[PDB]
Every structure is written in C-alpha cells, then in structure tokens.
C-alpha cells in the first residue's frame, strides 16, 4: 500500500507545487 | 397526500429517531452474532430465544418501515428509492420468516439462502452514519475505474488458465510422479552402484493432494479449477510448495517451462496488475474525497 | 512549593540526566532480553542474578521517579500527566516485585500478567528521544482516521463469519469427506470397470486438521472461530490449501458457493479494505508530519 | 492504389465494424474457455464441435483481415505495422490449423506451442477498446523505467543464489539432518539419564522434501534451483517452514549464518527492492496518465 | 606526481575503458554463476577451468587497478576513497586466492567466508553505470529515514518476543497437547456415550514440528527463537497453521489470549509498521529523485 499510497502522494505535491 | 403525513415524515427524519433505528440495527447484528456464537448448532439449545428475538426485531422493523413510508405516502419512487427498496426487501424477508414461524413451512427448503439475508441488515446502518456512508459511496464510485484493469487481469488469468489446463491437466495422473536425483555427481553414491543397482537416480513421489485428487486433476483439471488455482497463486497462497514445485521438478531437463510459466504469471499478474488495480482504486477514492 | 524544589526540577530536565535515564531504560530492556535468551527456563540456572538485577533496576527507577516528582511537589496533575502516571504504574509494579522478592508471596498467583508489565518499561524511552516520540504521537493521532474503515472491515468480517458458521460448521463432521473424481472422462480408467467395481469416481479423504478438530469445527465451528479464520484469510495465510479448497471441492457440482464465498471475501476485505485502511492511516500520519 | 480500395478502407475503420470484430474476438476467447472447461480431456467428447468452431473463427478472421489489408493495398508497412503483423501471425497460425484439420498432419509434433497461440488472440481486443489500449500502452512505456531497478534486483538475487549454492547445496544430503534439543536445561529430562542413555539431546529429522529431493539438492542444488528458491522467498511463499528453518536449525550454534542470510535477503530484496520497483512502475504509469 | 601519471589518469577515465571494465565485471559475475550452475559440487568435474578462470580474472583486475592507482600516485585518499578501497579489498582477496592456488594453503580453513567475497565483485559495476549508481545512492541516503521506524519495529518485536517466550516456551512440552472437542452439543455423539466411555471430548495432538522440536521449544524456546518466529509472522509466512493455531486451540476457554496476541501483533507490526517503514523509505527515495 505504501508503494501505492506514496505514488498517489507524488501526484498531490506535484499538484501542490503546480498551484504554488 | 395524507392529512397527518408531513408530521410523521419530519418525525422519522429526526436525528434521535435515526440514532434509535441505528441502535436497533446494531442490536440485531449483535443478536445474530450471539446466535452464531453461543448456539449455532443443528440441535439448538435456546431455540425459541433466537426465534422470538428475530420475531420482535422484524416486527419493530416493520413498524418503523411503515412509519417511514407513511410520510412518503407509500410511494418510495421519488425519495431515496434505493435505500427504501433495500429496506423493503429485508423487512419482507423478516415477514416471511415470522409467517413461517407462526404458520408452518410455506416455503420449499430450496430458498434458505434468501432467509440468509438477515445477516445483511447491518448494511442499513451505513445510511444512519455519515462517515460509513461516505466510505461506501466512494468505494461504489471508484469501482468503475477499477473495471478496466480488472478485466485485463481476468483476461490474462483466463489465458494462463487455458495454458495450464493444456499443459498440466495430465500431470501426476497415475498418482505418483518421478523426480530425478543427481546423487552420483554430488558424490552421495558411487557411479558403479547406480548402474549395478544399489542406488537409483530416480524416485517416485506421490502426486495426490490433501483433497484426494492428483495434482493435475485438482489444480488444472478443468478451466475453472485452473482459474481458481491461478487466483490462489495471484493472492500468493502456497503457489510453490503445492502448485509450482511439483510441476517444476516434474520436467527432468525441461524445467524452464514451469518456472517461466509461474514466474511470468506471478510477476505480471500479481505484482504489476494487482498494484495497478489497487493504485487506480485508491486514486479514484481519494479524488472523490476532495 | 518545596524550598529546594525548583533546583531539582530543572536538574531532572537536564539533557544529560534524560540521556542517563534513557540508557537505564535501554539497559533494563537488554537485561530482560538477556534473561529471556540465556535463562528463560522454569528451572533457572542464574536465578538470583535476574532477581537482584530487577531489584536494582526498580530501586534506581524509584530514586529517579522520586527526583522527578519532588520537582513537581508530588502533584503530577498539571505537568505531563500521562507520562507521569505511566511511570508511576511501572514503578508500582517494580516495588511490588521487590516487596515479593523480600518478604514472600503477598499476591495470589492469578496476577502474573501484571508482573509482566516490566517488558513494557521500554516505552518510557520513547519520551527520552524526540524522533520516536514524533512517530508514536503520529500513530496515535492517525488511529482515529483509521477507526471508520476499521469498523467497516470488522462489520464485513462478522457478516462473512455468520455466513461461514451457517454454511461450513457441519463440514467434514464425520472426520472424512468425499471428493468426486472424473477418471472415466479423462480416460484414466474405462467406464466399464467403474460400474463393474474395479475403480470408483469417489475417493474419501480425511477432514481432520493439525489441531485434531474437523474442518468445520475448527475453522467455522463457532462465530469467534470463524472470525479468527477470516482474519487468517485476510492476512493471506494458507487460505486455500487449508481453509478454502476442502470446502470448494466438498461441493460436488455446487462449487460456485465456496469459490464465490472466498473469492469475494478476499477481494473485498483483503484487497479493497486493507489497502484503504493503510492508505488512510499513512495519509493521516504524513499530514501530521508537515 | 486499387480502384475500390478507399471505400473498403473507410468501411473497416467504421465503429460498428470495429465493435463487430471485437465481439468476434471475445466470442472466440469464450469459445476457447468453454473448450477448456467442458471438454479439455485427451479423449474429447465433442471433438468436431471445437474443431469446426476454430475452423469458422479462423475463416472469419481471414475474411476480415483480407478486408483490412485490401484497404491498405496489402502493404502493412506504413499504417499500424505492429498490430497488422500481430494479426498476420495469429491468422497464419489459424490457417495452419485449418490446413491441418483439412489435409492431415503437415507439421511435426514438436510445434504444439505455436498452435497454442490461439489463446493470445484476445490481445487483438485491446486495440478495439480505447481504455484497455491506454492501460497496456502505459504499461509498455513504464517497463523501461522498471528495467534498472529490476536488473539490480536480479543481480542481488544471483549473488544470494551463488552464496546459497555454496553453503546449503550439501545440506541434508544423507536425507536426514540432526537438530539438537536442550531438554536438560528445560527440565524435561534429568541430566543423569541423558548421559546414562534414557534420553538424548539430539533428534534426527528427515530432510527429504515433497518433491522427493533432499533440502539442499532441491532448494539450492544448482544455481538456477537456488535462483528459483530465492524468487519463491522474494514472493514470500513458505520461506520459513520449508526453505529457512531447516537450514537455520541445522546450525547447532552457528545459527546466525542462516538467520542473517534469509533475514537480510528478505529485508533488502523483498521489502526494499520490490517496493522500489513497484513505486517506479506506478510512478511512470501515472506520469503517462496525465 | 609521476611523469606519465596524468596521461594514464585520463586514460582510465575514458568511457571505452570504463565500459570494458564493466564488461569484465559482468563476465566475472557470469563466470561465477556458471560455476555455481554447471559445477558447484564438492567433487568438481572441471576444476582447473574455474581455478584458472578466477586466476585470469584477478590478474586482469590487478592490472586495471594498478592502472587506476598509477594515475592517482597510489594515494587513493583524495579521489573516490570508498570505491577505491572497495576495489582494493576485492583485488586483495583475488591475490590471496591466486597465491593459494599457486603455492599451497597459506590460510587456515576458518576464513572461507572471506574467500566468498568474489560474489560481491559485481557491486563494482554499479559505479560503471550511472542509473544503477543513482538507485543505490538513493537507497543509501533513504536508509537513515527508515532507521527510526525500523527501531520502533524492532522494539515492539522484542516486546512481543519477551511475552511469547514467557507464555508459550512451555507449550506442547510433552510433545503432545490436548484440544477439546464439542461433539455432544454438535450432535455427532450422544452425551450418554461420552460419559459412558465410547467417545471423548478431548483428543490428543502431537506438538512436534518438522524440525523435530516441540512447538514451544522451537518457535518461542528462547528470546532469539521467538524474535525469529515473530519475524516470520511479520513477513506473513505460515503464522496460523504452524505458529498461531496450535497455541490458540491449546487454550481450552482462554483462547482470547493467543488470538489477541497474534492479532494485535499482526495488525500493529505487519500492517501499521511495515507500511509506515516502506512509505518513509519510498518517500525519501523519491524526494532524492528530484
């Protein structure tokens, strides 16, 4: 899950960095 | 619209009434659990206890359902159709059970699985509490995202099942299969006695399983047996010591066949496909979260 | 406030004193580990060694605890209540152990589990080091996020446990169950001899388990046995070769029952629910990280 | 360019024709599954049924392929080369099968694996539906990201395989290995009788496996057997009760060897490397998603 | 600085020379793999083949190492100290092996594990290729992030190991343990015959394991055996059918003890701690990626 959960995280901060 | 319909309609939507109904559902679930724990036997010890407990629970659910429908004029098409029809079905099974307990067996013994629906009454609780409703709704709205990767998985699973039925459905058919030792080269026994007859490079080892079948007949006997065995391997349960290794070491020098079969199956399906499906499922759920 | 209270209060909060206490806790943990490694037997070889080691460790913890409380005027309500009361409980079990070692058995033999608390003294170290404290605090603040998905899991687990008790609690009850071969259609034996009596399509295989019980009585004998077996399947341990396959191949032509049972259980609970719970747990922890 | 080439070219690209071809592929897949389910035996019961079903399916695929190529002037170099050549190869195996069914066995019995390609015809469906095409294309474009971590994994796997072959290829070679009890210290038997000969602090337990081999000869007999066993441990299947524990308890007091071997192998390879590979795979796929 | 030092220094840093050295390392790795595959036996068939192959490989590595150091004036303190010293150690083992092959056994037979270092020569390749270097460097820089959660895991593992040694080290000590049936309530046998002596509610089950030990003595006999067994449970291997269930069903009515033990252990350690450790590891690696 940590492999799955972290992959989805990579998209959160990638999205977070996009708006910021 | 009935004259006293609006008052009872807003009465049922009261938070206190909703929590009382939730407590009733949880109490019924605990009653079923206690029945299956302290008295699940065919010769039940406290028989009327569970019989009349179910009687009272179905009666109370009937009264509360009638309260629910009387506020919507018995219509249940316009307001919360799915939950209302689910409630209808469970209360109907409840009335059927009470009618059987009162006036004999009006049903054939071939519909016990329909009586079994009482265990699924706890799903009514999910409408009572908002967080559990959110989680189940997110699961329902994320399943369609899963669908495509899931069908890819099942396609590949059926491909490997066809291959497995064609290859190993005949394996260990006598009930015993022969694996070949390498004792001479390893120096355990001299090369003279193996030809001379004191020792042998081959041993016959039984192929019968714990279920009484041979290896091929059970694991890959038919297409559906093969698909079930591949599901077992996909979950990762005993794929080597029971499913793979006898077939791997059946091949004297052609061992690359079974090893490549199971290794490629495990890698592709289990690792790649399971992780992809879980990733897309969780991605859809968290995209629905915000 | 005591006259010499502030000086000792700031003395205990010294980094050197905190690290010395941390070293003491780690040394006690290593002492317990060494006791359980080199001499865990009922007939202990070096008996007084561990007895007096525990004596000295509890004495030192008592002296350091008294130093801790003397700086807070023995109050421990206003400053770090939870850690202080935990410390208090462990010293209390330590003083109880020393009192028993000094003046006989003042306790009934029914409270050994309370004496067992010495193994949990290492949890005091987590307050000494900031990083371990951060991790455990994040775990504690992420558990409530888990709670809802966890209760959904246990609800579904109990549903499947009720179903399993109702279905398979009677399985393999004689101790042996019959699986049906398909030998004639596979050509292993001619159809003439099967009717004639040389071969049969139905071998009988024992259901008894490694624990001596039959399959139904152990795995799904009662509701709690069923819930434990479903937890075993949820973790993924031996769900097929022990739990599923005997029930799957018990059904002669109704095999869809057990296969759908275990397949749906595994998919929903294990894959979906385990990954959802872990995802929400880790999400809460990393949201607490920053 | 042929005179009536453009019309048939745009006719084949029609959505209705594409869905009809997709239905044909799915129907062929279901036909293969039904063949392997209801009649996979060597003595097939409905023999001509599957024979002529495959005949008709290959004939229809031939006619539709000729329709596909006639719109591209039989060129298939410029437009969708890979899918066209895959289609070509499957029809070619289909025409080969029909030719064998019509005019005897024109092939040696050593190319059944080439006839086996009919199971992979369902891969043609992935071009028919856009979502499955997206998923498989993302998998293909994410594999190269996996490649580096995968080769690191296999390098470490081969290192551990060399070590395992060198250490344990000789283990349990007699067929039985000796583990040493500690009964006298546990109080199970007095120290007098162990020297006196009533009891022994050693027991001899068989090393033979379910496949008939000894432990060393099967698990780590050769480098490829060792690599397969390490793959089994990497997936996590029965690494202790079959692979690790006999070697761990073979070492009387040198147990640190096998424990460190398998513990370090599991930690590094399984945890670290499996999670890294899956993380990079999924990262590449979702980076391709958007 | 040597007169002809700069020329050879830039000569060794040439891409072609680096790729030739990488090919040499990969060829040596393949040579070791082939040795362990086609001739790992104690009575080696092609003995001088591997002996002189290792001779030539160590000689070539010596010549290339001398080329490497001659460009840095044999200093190796200022430029790439870690890789240079690793190279030094492997070439030293190589010279030691060649010296033993030339002039007899100059070493005691107690340092074969040092000769074993030839299998780790492939780690030199990781410096040759940039991508593998990136991955291993990221792993090395992410391990310290793991350290804290890893030590929390091992602390909890040792806690559960102490508890397990204290509880179950005495379990199945006679070699057989008694589980209690519930036949009379289930109706399998009448209550009259159980008292009368035809049937019994208590079967006796052997506690001996595949390794010859009893259940307690092997799984939780000592603290380190307990820690290994808990690592086995943490990975998820056979924790129920071998480790948990005999202890669970040993408790006649106190079954809550073992079930809570193993359930809490699995949940906390496996699910929570394994997923947390993997999450922080992968997070650190991908934070190092960009």
Residue numbers in the entry:
A (entry chain E): 2 to 21
B (entry chain C), C (entry chain D), D (entry chain A), E (entry chain B): 69 to 358
Copy out sentences from the published article reporting this entry, exactly as the authors wrote them.
To assess the potential Ca2+-dependent activation, we measured NaVEhWT currents in the presence of Ca2+ or EGTA using the whole-cell patch clamp recording of HEK293 cells. The NaVEh-expressing cells consistently generated robust inward currents regardless of with Ca2+ or EGTA. To further assess the potential regulation of NaVEh by Ca2+ from a structural aspect, we determined the cryo-EM structures of NaVEh in the presence of 2 mM Ca2+ (NaVEhWT_Ca) and 2 mM EGTA (NaVEhWT_EGTA), respectively. The resulting two structures are essentially identical with a root mean square deviation (RMSD) of 0.37 Å, and only subtle conformational shifts between the side-chains in the extracellular loops (ECLs) of the structures can be observed. These results confirm that Ca2+ has negligible effects on the function and structure of NaVEh. In the presence of the N-helix, the channel activates in response to depolarizing pulses, then the N-helix quickly blocks the open activation gate, resulting in the fast inactivation of NaVEh.
